[PDB]
Write an enzyme that holds these catalytic residues in place. Structure first.
Site, short mmCIF file in Angstrom:
data_model
loop_
_atom_site.label_atom_id
_atom_site.label_comp_id
_atom_site.label_asym_id
_atom_site.label_seq_id
_atom_site.Cartn_x
_atom_site.Cartn_y
_atom_site.Cartn_z
N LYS A 11 -3.01 9.44 -3.52
CA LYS A 11 -2.53 10.71 -2.98
C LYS A 11 -1.68 11.55 -3.88
CE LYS A 11 -3.01 10.21 2.18
NZ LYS A 11 -3.24 8.87 2.75
N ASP B 280 0.86 -1.18 0.00
CA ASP B 280 0.00 0.00 0.00
C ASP B 280 0.90 1.22 0.00
OD1 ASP B 280 -1.70 2.21 0.53
OD2 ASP B 280 -2.70 1.20 2.17
C1 LIG Z 1 -4.10 7.96 2.54
C2 LIG Z 1 -4.00 6.49 2.63
C3 LIG Z 1 -5.06 5.64 2.37
C4 LIG Z 1 -6.48 5.89 2.01
O1 LIG Z 1 -6.84 6.98 1.34
P1 LIG Z 1 -8.05 7.95 1.29
O2 LIG Z 1 -7.82 8.82 0.05
O3 LIG Z 1 -8.07 8.63 2.61
O4 LIG Z 1 -9.43 7.21 1.04
C5 LIG Z 1 -4.83 4.29 2.46
N1 LIG Z 1 -3.65 3.81 2.79
C6 LIG Z 1 -2.60 4.55 3.05
C7 LIG Z 1 -1.32 3.85 3.40
C8 LIG Z 1 -2.75 5.94 2.97
O5 LIG Z 1 -1.69 6.67 3.24
C1 LIG Z 2 -6.43 12.23 5.24
C2 LIG Z 2 -6.70 10.78 5.05
N1 LIG Z 2 -7.77 10.25 5.94
C3 LIG Z 2 -5.55 9.83 5.43
O1 LIG Z 2 -5.34 8.99 4.55
C4 LIG Z 2 -4.70 9.67 6.63
C5 LIG Z 2 -4.17 10.92 7.28
C6 LIG Z 2 -4.53 10.67 8.76
C7 LIG Z 2 -3.86 11.69 9.65
C8 LIG Z 2 -4.66 11.91 10.94
C9 LIG Z 2 -4.94 13.39 11.13
O2 LIG Z 2 -4.69 14.21 10.20
O3 LIG Z 2 -5.42 13.82 12.20
#
Ligand SMILES: *Cc1c(COP(=O)(O)O)cnc(C)c1O
Ligand SMILES: C[C@H](N)C(=O)CCCCCC(=O)O
Ligand SMILES: *Cc1c(COP(=O)(O)O)cnc(C)c1O
Ligand SMILES: C[C@H](N)C(=O)CCCCCC(=O)O
Ligand code: NA
Ligand code: NA
Lengths: 416, 415
Positions: A264, A235
């Protein structure tokens, strides 16, 4: 924006990971440029988060802006069921070519969690097609894979069908201790034939703790996976596209997973898009059990593919390596002193990931406010005050972030 | 596009719902305009699907194009954690104001299935916060809620944690009370296990393009209130005027506790989604401390602006006369399909024109036939349906209906 606008946001709009009866202060942003977010009052803020790590090239990037605008002129969107187009082909050509050789089948999706869910689904259809009943996933403690249900079943139970949870990789990226291996090997021994896939974030365990582990782990996990015939899902939604110093973080261990999840920074933090790559053996096996039961409405979206094409093209210059190398050096130098503060528990840096782990959980509202007053945008979280800035950030902009981070950890003011 | 480009697509790229060793023909589209898709060779095609029903205003719409370009000039994206912006506020103002009064709390997301998953999660956190252990969902047969895992758990098991599946609504859009014993029976047996009821209002899309009687929603809402159970309305396919009303719940004059939106939300420009709930639901969740969800690109400035421009177009009100006339026109022109031997039924509603067949179609061959008629229609299973953009020209509607009528004359394109 107005004050009635801001009253409305607070009363009617849910923000990510927060309360509706007790929201945390939100800052009104009217535009962005370079590595700065401009606020409604005029104040500029150095972005240390890259908009949750997607905006690797910063904001209002001319190459990105042009790509998007060109594509809008042709079509932002068209369905992908029985239709194909230039932007998606281009993007899949780049994705196949920049990833390990085995990975040549691309399933475009719309968000990170869907990319994981698709990977999981491929894993499960794979075994069903071969007649084996393999339904569990072996992942690691401290892993984070997204918020949809499937993704939630493989996240750490602390940070729903039961999966296997091996010990967080202890060996840092640091000496390799063979003792770190027992937990995992034991679980594999006990469940090898139940396990459909192994899923992990390579090297850097992001949201689950900003944990940097030893590349030998990937070497071993890959060898065990091969031994047992089990699939390896990597991932790289957080690690992909140069963040850790290499284009894909799996490069550190010189290995290829069976399934690779991307997102991302795939689009340059312009808009949502995602990708799950697999191998021919995986893609063909699935088809032959007749199909792959998945198809988001906006799959392959012309506009998002073009933005991602423009972002991947920027990386083609090669400039991110020296950029991430110097950011790594600079975070190491400037956060070192944080090793003398009393709120600090550890300082770890890798590529353009600068982390300051705390003894006590931060008070986000008060710490955020403090950073905003310093002219910087940093979003702490739990016991982590980490920086993940755009690769083209200026050294002086990196200095304000690190300076503000150092100041924040001097005492308990902003803690708990 | 080149021939090497197209070999690459077929060998390396997975398309939706198909095989990698046996893909079905794909048509190379270079651009789109009005209600037409332009192909690599120059051929134009009248779009009868609206790009899987999202493009309600057609393609290359100047208002939409301007909105998107303006916002790119300001910023396509910024995070939403501890930050807010104009496009999102605007959009949530419009969403709160165009939906039933109870629905005033908006949680923006990225796609249809995430919207459902968020709704599901809200349902479950709600009960947990009140100490109740309610974990199952009561849905209907023939329901389709998306492809992620949570969504798969409430899709029809024919068309995974075990939910409850009340018999599909039979009452065609007369009403009959028998329809109800099954649903009622299942509710009786599991009332306290049930966290929520989830259904597509009035039109059950991907699960069969089934049009049922509005009394169902009236009853389901009343039972839900009786038992204190939440009502999730999945309007990802029905929303924004498709069935003749702005939201399909209007037909029954009811409001769900949670409403899921997507597809036509942005005018088919790009992906975006929204799950609305009530204050009682949003506040309860917060108080058990938060709502554990946050897509990376949540509230994305560029997608919100496109959706703002699409909701503004609907503000003129013009879609009502447009959908009314498309409904009349599909009725008239598909009528004859009731005399074809491959046809099993003809049902029409709003801008939804469905021809249900006796035999499953052969997509590759049927698609090819539609492309040769200058139309873009994607049949599926036993359904040859039209869901065109609201501003389609009458003549463009005629080529679709004509092509549909021709396709069902005999078994050539069947099985
Ligand atoms: C950000 C992230 C996700 C999931 O992504 P979303 O765009 O928040 O739905 C999944 N796995 C990892 C390792 C990530 O960093
Ligand atoms: C933004 C998205 N939910 C993600 O993939 C993880 C980031 C999580 C960080 C926790 C925070 O910002 O408080
Ligand atoms: C299209 C649709 C979905 C899911 O949406 P995706 O965008 O495919 O992820 C869910 N429910 C209904 C009723 C839909 O029509
Ligand atoms: C696009 C999305 N998966 C959806 O909600 C409906 C499409 C399902 C019908 C199957 C088809 O078009 O072939
Ligand atoms: Na590859
Ligand atoms: Na409302």
């Amino acid at each position: 924006m107005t004050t009635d606008d801001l009253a409305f946001d607070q009363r009617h709009i849910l923000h990510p990971y927060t309360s509706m009866t007790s929201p945390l202060p939100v800052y009104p942003v009217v535009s962005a440029e370079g590595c700065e977010l401009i606020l409604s009052d005029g104040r500029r803020l150095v972005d240390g988060m890259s908009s949750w790590w997607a905006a690797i090239h910063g904001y209002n990037h001319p190459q990105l802006n042009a790509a998007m605008k060109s594509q809008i002129d042709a079509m932002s969107h068209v369905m992908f069921g029985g239709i194909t187009h230039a932007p998606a082909i281009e993007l899949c050509r780049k994705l196949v070519a920049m990833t390990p050789q085995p990975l040549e089948c691309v399933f475009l999706a719309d968000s990170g969690s869907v990319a994981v869910e698709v990977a999981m689904k491929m894993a499960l259809q794979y075994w069903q097609a071969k007649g084996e009943a393999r339904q569990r996933f072996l992942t690691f403690r401290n892993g984070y894979h997204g918020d949809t249900f499937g993704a939630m079943s493989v996240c750490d139970p602390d940070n729903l069908p039961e999966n296997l949870f091996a010990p967080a990789p202890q060996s840092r990226m640091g000496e390799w201790d063979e003792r770190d291996m027992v937990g995992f090997a034991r679980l594999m021994a006990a469940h090898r034939h139940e396990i459909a896939a192994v899923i992990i974030e390579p090297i850097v365990q992001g949201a689950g703790g900003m944990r940097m582990y030893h590349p030998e782990w990937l070497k071993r996990i890959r060898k065990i996976c091969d031994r047992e015939g089990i699939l390896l899902i990597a991932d790289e939604i957080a690690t992909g596209f140069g963040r850790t110093g290499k284009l894909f973080a799996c490069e550190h261990a010189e290995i290829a997973p069976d399934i690779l999840c991307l997102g991302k920074a795939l689009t340059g933090g312009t808009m949502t898009l995602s990708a799950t790559l697999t191998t021919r053996e995986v893609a063909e096996t699935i088809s032959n059990g007749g199909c792959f039961m998945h198809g988001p409405t906006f799959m392959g979206n012309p506009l998002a593919c073009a933005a991602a094409n423009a972002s991947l093209a920027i990386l083609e210059s090669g400039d991110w390596q020296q950029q991430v190398a110097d950011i790594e050096v600079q975070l190491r130098e400037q956060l070192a002193p944080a090793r003398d503060a009393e709120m600090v528990a550890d300082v770890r840096v890798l590529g353009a990931i600068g982390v300051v782990e705390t003894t006590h959980p931060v008070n986000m509202a008060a710490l955020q406010k403090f950073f905003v007053e310093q002219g910087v945008w940093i979003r702490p979280f739990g016991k982590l005050i980490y920086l993940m800035p755009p690769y083209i950030i200026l050294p002086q902009q990196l200095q304000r972030l690190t300076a503000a981070v150092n100041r924040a950890v001097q005492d308990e003011t902003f803690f708990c």
